[PDB]
């Protein structure tokens, strides 16, 4: 996240870190005690058997007893287009069920087909790059963003920080976009580099996948 701020510890207990060899590479969202959702491109060219799903984290630089760690048991994708980044969403069943508590909670999702119009206010988040040559964030970052339809396509939810250069960045992919307390997006891609101030950020449109999600996580 470029130009955001530290989240308060465990402010977003649905926030998940996907890790390889003990290192964060993508966000995810806990959507049931034994399922998370992320961006399909996050798991595309990696050994999924080695992926660790880290719940309850805040500071990547610390050992945190609040953490619960799982592995991937099952993978669901529905028409993921790796070239155009269409349907960039994956559901990952975990090898067990999280203990639900203050620091580990399931997210709330929108109704199928629910559309946020140009102009709605949301919150992006993630442990991705803080900026060019600044590396990934130790502490979970969050960022006030605005849903926009300008420079967007129907198959994405797009957001922009109006008036300054800020946005999501590498390592933020897979992370939730929260609008009215509901997860309406999964970070997918930037254009013109991160925080260009020229192109909005693009999210997989969760609300287009709710029936499919419903069919899997129950
Ligand atoms: C920056 O955003 C925060 C939080 O945004 C709200 O909560 C997000 C998780 C998401 O659901 C968004 O769509 C929401 O808009 C704002 O903090 C809220 O501010 C309102 C108005 O003051 C207040 O009633 C709420 O208590 C706050 N919500 C939370 C979760 O703390 C904040 O106002 C935004 N700042 C600006 C200037 O945009
Ligand atoms: C799931 O995998 C993790 C990490 O490899 C392991 O520690 C744990 O035993 C597994 N959990 C369950 C419930 O099988």
How many Å apart are CA 188 and CA 206, to the nearest integer?
11
Question: Burial code of 71-88, b = ≥16 C-beta within 10 A, e = fewer?
Answer: ebeeebeeebeeeebbbb
- Take atom 13 of ligand 2 and give the residue whose Cα is closest: 96
Query: Computed from CA positions of residues 206, 33, 181, 28, in that sequence, does the dihedral angle turn out positive or negative?
Result: negative
The answer to whether 173 is a known catalytic residue is yes
Coil, strand or helix: which one is 149?
coil
145 pocket-lining for ligand 1 (C-beta < 6 Å): no
Taken in order 176, 177, 180, 184, is the CA torsion positive or negative?
A: negative
State if residue 144 touches ligand 1 by the CB under 6 angstroms criterion: yes
List the beta bridge partners of residue 81.
86
- For tokens 């805040």, the residue is 58
Neighbours of 91 (CB within 10 A): 23
- Set out the domains of the chain in order of their start, with CATH numbers: 1-12+107-207 (2.40.10.10), 13-106+208-218 (2.40.10.10)
Collapsing DSSP states into helix, strand and coil, what is residue 11?
A: coil
Experimental approach was: X-ray
Resolution in A: 1.9
Q: Is the CB of 178 under 6 A from ligand 1?
A: yes
CA distance 120 to 162: 12
Q: Ligand 2 atom 12: the closest Cα is on which residue?
A: 96
DSSP 101-131: BTTB-----PPTT----TT-EEEEEESSBSS
Show the tokens assigned to 179.
């609008």
Cα separation, 202 vs 153, in Å, equals 9
Q: How far apart are CA 76 and CA 74, in angstroms?
A: 7
d(CA 164, CA 144): 12
CB-CB contact of 137 with 127 (8 Å): yes
Active site residue 88: yes
């Amino acid at each position: 996240i470029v130009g955001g701020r530290r989240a308060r510890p465990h402010a977003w207990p649905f926030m998940v870190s996907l890790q390889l060899r003990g290192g964060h590479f993508c966000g995810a969202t806990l959507i049931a005690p034994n399922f998370v959702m992320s961006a399909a491109h996050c798991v595309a060219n990696v050994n999924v058997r080695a992926v660790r799903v880290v719940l309850g984290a805040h500071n990547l630089s610390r050992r945190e007893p609040t953490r619960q760690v799982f592995a991937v048991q099952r993978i669901f994708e529905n028409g993921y287009d790796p070239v155009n980044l269409l349907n960039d969403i994956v559901i990952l069943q975990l090898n067990g069920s999280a203990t639900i508590n203050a620091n580990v909670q399931v997210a709330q999702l929108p109704a199928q087909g629910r559309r946020l119009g140009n102009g709605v206010q949301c919150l992006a988040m993630g442990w991705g790059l803080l900026g060019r040559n600044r590396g990934i964030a130790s502490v979970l970052q969050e960022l006030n963003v605005t849903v926009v339809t300008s420079l967007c396509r129907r198959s994405n939810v797009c957001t922009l920080v109006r008036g300054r250069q800020a946005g999501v960045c590498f390592g933020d992919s897979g992370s939730p976009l929260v609008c009215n307390g509901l997860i309406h997006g999964i970070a997918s891609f930037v254009r013109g580099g991160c925080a260009s101030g020229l192109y909005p950020d693009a999210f997989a449109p969760v609300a287009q996948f709710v029936n499919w999600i419903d069919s899997i996580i129950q």
